[PDB]
Amino acid sequence: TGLLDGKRILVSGIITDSSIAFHIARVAQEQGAQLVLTGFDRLRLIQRITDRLPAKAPLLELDVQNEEHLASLAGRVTEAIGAGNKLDGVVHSIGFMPQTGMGINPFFDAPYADVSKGIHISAYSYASMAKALLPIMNPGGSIVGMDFDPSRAMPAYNWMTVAKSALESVNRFVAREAGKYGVRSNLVAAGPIRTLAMSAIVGGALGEEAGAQIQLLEEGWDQRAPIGWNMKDATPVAKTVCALLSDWLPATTGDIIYADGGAHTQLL
Amino acid sequence: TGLLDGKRILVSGIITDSSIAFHIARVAQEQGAQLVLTGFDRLRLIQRITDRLPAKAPLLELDVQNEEHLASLAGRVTEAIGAGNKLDGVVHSIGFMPQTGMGINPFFDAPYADVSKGIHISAYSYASMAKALLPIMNPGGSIVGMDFDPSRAMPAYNWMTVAKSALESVNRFVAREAGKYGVRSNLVAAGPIRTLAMSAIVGGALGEEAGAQIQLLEEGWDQRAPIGWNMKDATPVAKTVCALLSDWLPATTGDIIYADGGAHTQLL
Amino acid sequence: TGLLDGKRILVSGIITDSSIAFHIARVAQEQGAQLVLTGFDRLRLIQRITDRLPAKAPLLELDVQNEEHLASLAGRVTEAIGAGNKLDGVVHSIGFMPQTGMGINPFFDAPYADVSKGIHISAYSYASMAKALLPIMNPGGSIVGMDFDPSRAMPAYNWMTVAKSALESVNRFVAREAGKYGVRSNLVAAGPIRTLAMSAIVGGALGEEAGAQIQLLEEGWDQRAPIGWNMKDATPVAKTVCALLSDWLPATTGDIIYADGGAHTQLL
Amino acid sequence: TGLLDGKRILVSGIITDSSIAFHIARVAQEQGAQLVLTGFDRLRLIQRITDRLPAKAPLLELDVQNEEHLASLAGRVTEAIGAGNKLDGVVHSIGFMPQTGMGINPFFDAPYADVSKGIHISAYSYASMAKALLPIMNPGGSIVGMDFDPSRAMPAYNWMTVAKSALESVNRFVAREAGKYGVRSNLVAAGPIRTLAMSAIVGGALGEEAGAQIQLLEEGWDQRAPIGWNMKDATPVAKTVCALLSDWLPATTGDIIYADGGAHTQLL
Ligand SMILES: NC(=O)c1ccc[n+]([C@@H]2O[C@H](COP(=O)([O-])OP(=O)(O)OC[C@H]3O[C@@H](n4cnc5c(N)ncnc54)[C@H](O)[C@@H]3O)[C@@H](O)[C@H]2O)c1
Ligand SMILES: NC(=O)c1ccc[n+]([C@@H]2O[C@H](COP(=O)([O-])OP(=O)(O)OC[C@H]3O[C@@H](n4cnc5c(N)ncnc54)[C@H](O)[C@@H]3O)[C@@H](O)[C@H]2O)c1
Ligand SMILES: NC(=O)c1ccc[n+]([C@@H]2O[C@H](COP(=O)([O-])OP(=O)(O)OC[C@H]3O[C@@H](n4cnc5c(N)ncnc54)[C@H](O)[C@@H]3O)[C@@H](O)[C@H]2O)c1
Ligand SMILES: NC(=O)c1ccc[n+]([C@@H]2O[C@H](COP(=O)([O-])OP(=O)(O)OC[C@H]3O[C@@H](n4cnc5c(N)ncnc54)[C@H](O)[C@@H]3O)[C@@H](O)[C@H]2O)c1
Ligand SMILES: O=C(O)c1cc2ccccc2cc1O
Ligand SMILES: O=C(O)c1cc2ccccc2cc1O
Ligand SMILES: O=C(O)c1cc2ccccc2cc1O
Ligand SMILES: O=C(O)c1cc2ccccc2cc1O
């Protein structure tokens, strides 16, 4: 009945009620999934946010740069879902690039310390979470991560786009490892979504030039998309993630599903 | 409950019980869809084959090279499903290339009359069916066609691969037109499936050289696929088509979903 | 000294002094190549046009839809360059799609007779010319064809884009055959060039809607290109074709080189 | 006469006489270029190696992880080529990934410290060198870097492939910056070349499993390539780099040229 009835799914990446992962979690619960949530740093805030989900879910702390958090993660999940139970799904919805790499300054001005932190959080951590959680995943399981199509350079978000190029490559290798467990690994490449951070950047948080370029980027998306694109509505993206978590794409792995209104298939 | 409960879906392309479209139809009916079937030329044979589906379905004749069949198709579908009802889904599972283009002779020996017939049936007809059926499709509907990844040349099936390259391009334009109706258009790129025609070719129907090349092509597929690939089992492909017919990929159009075990994401 | 000193090269596709093939021929002669030209239908006009090239060149008639022209072509070339001499290069600069397929009407209104004629001239003929000329090509030779990136759908030129998708696929198979002769086969994907036909379409030859869409398409190209794009200057495209005809890309075949200002690598 | 007559070109990446950059330098000098070389760490060794080039060239020390080396690089180049002279070309032939990331252990066992060092040297440094050298490059200049097609995952060299995915993305952004100077930026994606490090790995330096997988990877390359692939001969790769350094690909930037025998265009 529900698309994800009886499935146990870990969802990372909630920080506000406009996080893509908040809508992934809401839709997954609507479809019968039992969730375990992970959050970074502001756990009191995240608990208050996730109190608004349709069902209660245990919240675990996870800083993906903390090797001790990752080393203990599987045992804390098993404690939360009960011994003898394993996960059927894992959602990676985690990304960050320090400001020096996202247009507040020229691409050339980002120090490598900043780029390497962003690639750690946004790309390497996808392999990190798979390594931690595959030992407690059931055959037929599914790992899904969030992507923004990096196949062409864009005016702003420069180093973040490089990090997404690395993530797409990491995903293909995670699929190799996950296949030994009977588990699939895929990314959902979403169009632009007006999260709190996104709206701040359009408002000029990283400079007027970066704001104007991203606003024009957003506008062309809805113009290109044959079915349109609503940057204020994350539900179509959440449904696509749930599709990959379900049993209905069983021969897809190492791959990228585009939830972008079809915009990437059109020129003008 | 059922993935496709209450949806009205037209399925083309059944000719034997090993047709990919036979398994698409079976799975769609398992998931609550009400079907209308179309068949080419041997309608008595196709009716006997489809008597084995879990539910009865009206069968309409459709030769996609016959402009009179296409001009009458929408009215015959409306008669079959009842006035005031429209389609929610359309499945194109149609392909053919005369033997001169598929390895029985060198690529250079195929006369254009043969190539143009194959491109008519295998690529142009996707636009033909969309033109005929979009006027009787509901908003939120879905058109799905079958593909075999043509991004690289392969030893055999040469002109058929050229026809698939054309089909992928046709799909992106059909998505533009379908979007005006609130309808999505996508292809499923399947790995090799042992249909009756496929087994005959491996058995040497088009020459020993073509048979040996296709057998080695099949074997590398399961070796590359991180989750494996079973050429004897079309159900994973049928489930993927049903996923695209459902409401769970609502922001994907003009696109290609790979149901190939992940083989196209791996080198060796 | 000259990039193409001593090379014997056949160049198809001249019809006016704004043809891309006119500039290919001019640059090749500047670089020391000895040319044989082929022309379609209006041979008196083409001879008057090519009288303006820096050197005289024999002109042969070639309608690529005429099997008798193709069957005699190799012998007529050998007569023109002398017995015991072979070609080092072949340039395919041929394209056509009847008006019903290029935006004067909706994509769905093109009859297949029109599409099949356009695919014959624009895609199948690349294999046709390779079949005719490979028997009289030297090892180390090069076949080059002209392309317009069809990986995404564009507002107009719809069926012509489908034909380019087919041509890219044909090129990969021609490379397989040409390799047995020690010959490379590649396409140059050019940005928009203001030929006489192009200017007529922008002027509204195929309707005001098609004209406006193509004008906006052209403008975004120069905006995207990191080094800019001058649609009035075919010389950068001609130089790229000469690069592929030379010995300086000796390990590239079945491939596509983009002479588009870098526009296809950028989003906005 | 010479392809690169009068051009001033910096070439990084020589360490042995089997380095790809050694053959790039040799061919560039054969074609009239005046070189400045950069080398990492073992400068006495590199000078003895480059004494075998057809012409003497100044050698400058450059560790791309050393910000002081990069901050002084432009001034040291200007001293070497003379005040009032600028560079016409820059070759990046630099790559490294610590052993934990290249198959001596499972992909999951590479610590991020190792991955981040490899991405620093193999990808970020392409932007680092462009930032340092664009202020002393002439309009019409060219930056070229070395690539190994990372679009699909391969058995070994795992994290190095992720680093190449990042490099391809970096190249598209460097093209944006370089265009303001009238300079192009491109990568050459080479097939496998038997450098000293490559032969050591096939010999089992990183374990027997990694050695066997890379040997089978090499063998399929020559089998796929329509013109063949000779892993013992770097000259076709060097010629392709020289083609991009020349004026004969003037409308290509942000792009990738494949010098791989056509292998990436073929499946089997
Ligand atoms: N336009 C968009 O918003 C958009 C489009 C496509 C893809 N994405 C991707 O979707 C993902 C979710 O981003 P979002 O748009 O929902 O914004 P968001 O700010 O709501 O989510 C980012 C999440 O990353 C988490 N995070 C940051 N550092 C972490 C760390 N060290 N350890 C663990 N978690 C950490 C944040 O706590 C936060 O929960 C990101 O990968 C993003 O790049 C976003
Ligand atoms: N390995 C595979 O079998 C494989 C893999 C990927 C994609 N595909 C694609 O899946 C589609 C279905 O093929 P299949 O493998 O199930 O083989 P199949 O022979 O069972 O189906 C082919 C169908 O095309 C129909 N057809 C032929 N000419 C027609 C015409 N003039 N009008 C209407 N219908 C016509 C046949 O009647 C038949 O029903 C094809 O597009 C095929 O290329 C097949
Ligand atoms: N914007 C552009 O102009 C552009 C951009 C990229 C690629 N191209 C491609 O470059 C090629 C050359 O086109 P062009 O732009 O120089 O326009 P053009 O009109 O000058 O050249 C087209 C050529 O095709 C030839 N041709 C048509 N039918 C033929 C037949 N039956 N047999 C032999 N030749 C025939 C014409 O005679 C003409 O010489 C075409 O393939 C075109 O699609 C053009
Ligand atoms: N099969 C192949 O060999 C192959 C194929 C395609 C691409 N490539 C790429 O070609 C490039 C050249 O590699 P190669 O195959 O000639 O091997 P190589 O070992 O001869 O060259 C590697 C070079 O990187 C340099 N380097 C390492 N660390 C450095 C640092 N901190 N600062 C500056 N330089 C540093 C080395 O000193 C060495 O000169 C690399 O980017 C490689 O990935 C190699
Ligand atoms: O990685 C992202 O989250 C991302 C979001 C974007 C949102 C708007 C425009 C460009 C963007 C590029 C990105 O890499
Ligand atoms: O179009 C197809 O149905 C097709 C099937 C194949 C099946 C096996 C190998 C190659 C194949 C290529 C094709 O284009
Ligand atoms: O094939 C072509 O010649 C072609 C030219 C174009 C020129 C301008 C815009 C779109 C275009 C699409 C094409 O397929
Ligand atoms: O980056 C490289 O140098 C590289 C070389 C290879 C050489 C042989 C096989 C795989 C390889 C993968 C790589 O990323």
Q: Which of C83, C84, C92 is nearest to C37 (CA)?
A: C92
Alpha carbons B30 and D139: distance in angstroms, whole number: 65
3-state SS class at A264: helix
Neighbours of C215 (CB within 10 A): 13
Angstrom distances, CA of residue D71 to CA of A82, A158, B46, C263, D178 = 57, 22, 75, 32, 18
A89 forms beta bridges with A9, A142
Is B94 labeled as ligand-binding? Answer: yes
Amino acid at D129: M
Asked if the C-beta of B266 comes within 8 angstroms of chain D's C-beta atoms, the answer is yes
Shortest distance, CA B69 to any CA of chain C (angstroms): 15
CA atoms within a 13 Å half-sphere pointing along the CA-CB vector of B189: 23
Q: Tokens standing for A238?
A: 């959440």
β-sheet with B59-61: strand ranges across: B59-61, B34-39, B8-12, B87-92, B137-147, B184-190, B255-259
Q: How many whole angstroms separate alpha carbon D133 and alpha carbon D80?
A: 14
Residue at C118: amino acid letter: G
Judge contact between C22 and C99, C-beta under 8 A. Answer: no
Determined by which method?
X-ray
Q: Are D155 and D219 in contact (CB under 8 A)?
A: no
CA atoms within 13 A on the CB side of D38: 23
Residue A63: how many other CB atoms lie within 10 Å: 15
3-class DSSP string for chain C: CCCCCCCEEEEECCCCCCCHHHHHHHHHHHCCCEEEEEECCCHHHHHHHHCCCCCCCCEEECCCCCHHHHHHHHHHHHHHHCCCCCEEEEEECCCCCCHHHCCCCCHHHCCHHHHHHHHHHHHHHHHHHHHHHHHHEEEEEEEEEEECCCCCECCCCHHHHHHHHHHHHHHHHHHHHHHCCCCEEEEEEECCCCCHHHHHHHCCCCCHHHHHHHHHHHHHHHHHCCCCCCCCCCHHHHHHHHHHHCCCCCCCCCEEEEECCCHHHECC
Q: Decide: D166 and A158 in contact? Cβ < 8 Å.
A: no
**Atom of ligand 3 minimally distant from the CA of C14:** 39
Angle between helices B235-245 and B20-30 (to 10 degrees): 60
Binding residue numbers of A for NAD(+): 19-20, 63-64, 94-95, 164, 193
| Rounded distance between C-alpha atoms, residue C97 and residue A12, angstroms | 52
CA nearest neighbour of D173 among A100, C265, C219: C265
Identify which of A213, A264, A268 has the shortest CB distance to residue C216.
Answer: A268
CA of D87 to the centre of ligand 4 (A): 22
At a CB cut-off of 8 Å and minimum separation 6, what does D264 contact?
A: B152, D149, D151, D189, D258
State in Å: Cα D156 to ligand 8 middle. Answer: 8
* Cβ atoms D146, D93 nearer than 8 A: yes
The C-alpha angle A193, A224, A232, rounded to 5 degrees, equals 20
CA angle B44, B50, B53 (to 5 degrees): 165
Measured CA to CA, the distance from residue B28 to residue B32 in angstroms comes to 7
Tokens in use for B95? Answer: 């392909």
Number of A/D CB contacts below 8 angstroms equals 78
CA dihedral of residues A171, A177, A178, A180 (deg, nearest 10): 150
Strands C184-190 and C137-147: parallel
Angle at B194 between CA B192 and CA B200, to 5 degrees: 115
CA distance B170 to B123: 7
> Would you call C137 an interface residue with chain B, using a CB distance cutoff of 8 Å?
no
**Cα separation, A146 vs D178, whole angstroms:** 31
User: Which residue has tokens 């043969």?
Assistant: B114
Domains in chain C: ranges and CATH: 1-268 (3.40.50.720)
- Determine the Cα–Cα distance for residues D266 and A196; give it in Å rounded to an integer: 45
Inter-chain CB proximity B254 and A262 less than 8 Å: yes
Which residue type sits at C202?
A: V
Distance of CA A12 to the CA centre of its chain: 8
Report CA-CA distances (Å) from C66 to C70, C111, D231. Answer: 7, 22, 43
Among D169, A144, A266, D118, smallest CA distance to C217 is for A266
Binding partners of C (≥3 Cβ pairs within 8 A): A, B, D
Q: Distances from the Cα of B211 to the Cαs of A48, B156, B202, C133, in angstroms?
A: 63, 9, 4, 29
CA dist list (Å): B50 to B26, B237, C226? 9, 19, 57
Per the CB < 8 A criterion, the answer to whether B171 and B254 are in contact is yes
B neighbour chains, 3+ CB pairs within 8 Å: A, C, D
For D118, half-sphere exposure in the C-beta direction (CA atoms, 13 angstrom radius) is 26
CB C90 within 8 A of CB C137: yes
DSSP state of A37: E
Q: Assess D262–B contact: CB distance below 8 Å, yes or no.
A: no
Secondary structure letter of residue A182 according to DSSP: T
Interchain contact A227–B (C-beta under 8 A): yes
* Cα dihedral: D192, D196, D198, D203 (round 10): 140
Q: Check CB contact under 8 Å for B153 and D266.
A: yes
Q: Measured in Å, how far apart are chain A's first and last C-alpha atoms?
A: 40
Structure-token match 């070759």, residue found: D91
Nearest alpha-carbon partner for C121 in C208, C45, C32, C13: C13
Among D157, D162, D170, D214, name the best residue to mutate to test ligand 8's pocket (greatest count of ligand atoms within 8 A of Cβ): D157
DSSP β-bridge partners for residue D34: D8
- Residue D37 in contact with residue D25, Cβ under 8 Å? yes
Joined together, the tokens standing for residue B239 give 């489930």
Q: Do D248 and C248 touch (CB under 8 A)?
A: yes
Phi/psi for A73 (5° steps) reads -65, -50
Tokens of B179: 């979007």
Give start and end residues of each alpha helix (H) in chain A: 20-30, 43-50, 67-81, 112-119, 125-133, 158-179, 196-202, 208-224, 235-245
DSSP state for residue A124 in the 8-state scheme = I
Best B240, B247, B258, B264 member to test A by mutation, with max A CBs in 10 Å, is B258
Q: Let me know: does D173 contact D184? Beta carbons within 8 Å.
A: no
Q: How many CB atoms lie within 10 A of CB D201?
A: 23
Contacts of B179 in chain A (CB under 8 A): 225-228, 262
Measured at the CA of B30, the angle between CA B26 and CA B35, to 5 degrees, comes to 60
Q: Directed axis angle between helix C158-179 and helix C125-133, to 10°?
A: 20
Two structure tokens written together for B12: 């083309």
| Number of CB atoms found within 10 A of residue A96's CB | 17
Is A265 strand, coil or helix? helix
Cβ(D104) – ligand 8 distance below 6 Å: no
Compute the distance between CA of residue D201 and CA of residue D103 in angstroms, rounded to an integer.
10
Ligand 3 centre from C123 Cα, in Å?
12
Q: What single-letter amino acid sits at C138?
A: N
Q: Residue A243 burial by CB count (10 A; 0-12/13-18/19+): exposed, middle or buried?
A: buried
- Sort residue D258 into left (φ over 0), alpha (ψ -120 to 50) or beta: beta
User: How far apart, in whole angstroms, are the C-alpha atoms of residue B267 and residue B264?
Assistant: 8
Is the Cβ–Cβ distance between D101 and D159 less than 8 Å? yes
Q: What count of CB pairs under 8 Å joins B to C?
A: 78
CB D134: neighbour CB atoms within 10 A?
21
For the four alpha carbons of D190, D195, D200 and D202, in that order, the dihedral sign comes to positive
Question: What span, in angstroms and rounded, lies between the C-alpha atoms of D136 and D138?
Answer: 7
Q: Six-digit token pair at D36?
A: 């400045």
**CA separation, residue C166 to residues B121, C121, C148 (Å):** 15, 11, 12
CA C47 → CA C20, C50, C51, C60, distances in Å?
Answer: 16, 5, 6, 10
Show the 3-state SS of chain D.
CCCCCCCEEEEECCCCCCCHHHHHHHHHHHCCCEEEEEECCCHHHHHHHHCCCCCCCCEEECCCCCHHHHHHHHHHHHHHHCCCCCEEEEEECCCCCCHHHCCCCCHHHCCHHHHHHHHHHHHHHHHHHHHHHHHHEEEEEEEEEEECCCCCECCCCHHHHHHHHHHHHHHHHHHHHHHCCCCEEEEEEECCCCCHHHHHHHCCCCCHHHHHHHHHHHHHHHHHCCCCCCCCCCHHHHHHHHHHHCCCCCCCCCEEEEECCCHHHECC
Greatest alpha-carbon pair distance for chain D in Å reads 54
Q: Which of B61, B58, B129, B69 is closest to B93 using CA atoms?
A: B129
Ligand 5 pocket by Cβ (under 6 Å): A 95, 148, 154, 157, 160-161, 164, 192, 214, 217
Note whether B74 and B135 are within 8 A (CB). Answer: yes
Chain center to CA of D259: 13
Most distant pair of Cα atoms in chain A: their distance: 54
By C-alpha distance, which of D213, D193, D188 is closest to D202? D213
Q: Which atom of ligand 7 is nearest to the CA of C147?
A: 1
Which token pair is D104? 């001596």
Distance separating alpha carbons of residues A37 and A230, to the nearest angstrom = 27
d(C-alpha C53, C-alpha C51), whole Å: 6
D85 token code pair: 């002279």
Burial A5-34 (b: 16+ CB within 10 A, else e): eebbbbbbbbbeebbbbbbbbbbbbbbebb
- Name the β-bridge partners of B170: none
Q: Is A263 left (phi over 0), alpha (psi -120 to 50) or beta?
A: alpha
Query: How would DSSP label each residue in chain B?
Result: --TTTT-EEEEE--SSTTSHHHHHHHHHHHTT-EEEEEE-S-HHHHHHHHTTSSS---EEE--TT-HHHHHHHHHHHHHHH-TT--EEEEEE------GGGTTSS-GGG--HHHHHHHHIIIIIHHHHHHHHHGGGEEEEEEEEEEE---SSB-SS-HHHHHHHHHHHHHHHHHHHHHHTTT-EEEEEEE-----HHHHHHHTTTT-HHHHHHHHHHHHHHHHH-TT---TT--HHHHHHHHHHHSSSSTT--SEEEEESTTGGGB--
Q: What gap in Å lies between CA C204 and CA C214, rounded to an integer?
A: 10
Q: Note the maximum CA span of chain B.
A: 54
Other C-beta atoms closer than 10 Å to the C-beta of D25 total 28
d(CA A252, CA B260): 7
The whole-angstrom separation of Cα D164 and Cα A166 is 8
Residue C189: what are its φ and ψ, rounded to 5°? Answer: -90, 105
Crossing angle, helix D112-119 and helix A112-119, to 10 degrees?
130
Question: Does an H or E element contain A184, and which?
Answer: strand A184-190
- Residue with tokens 């990877």, as numbered in its chain: D217
**Are A73 and A133 within 8 A, CB to CB?**
yes
Q: Which of D62, D71, D80 is nearest to D9 (CA)?
A: D80
**Nearest-angstrom CA–CA distance, B227 and B241:** 19
Region of residue C182 (left: phi > 0; alpha: psi -120 to 50; beta: else) = left
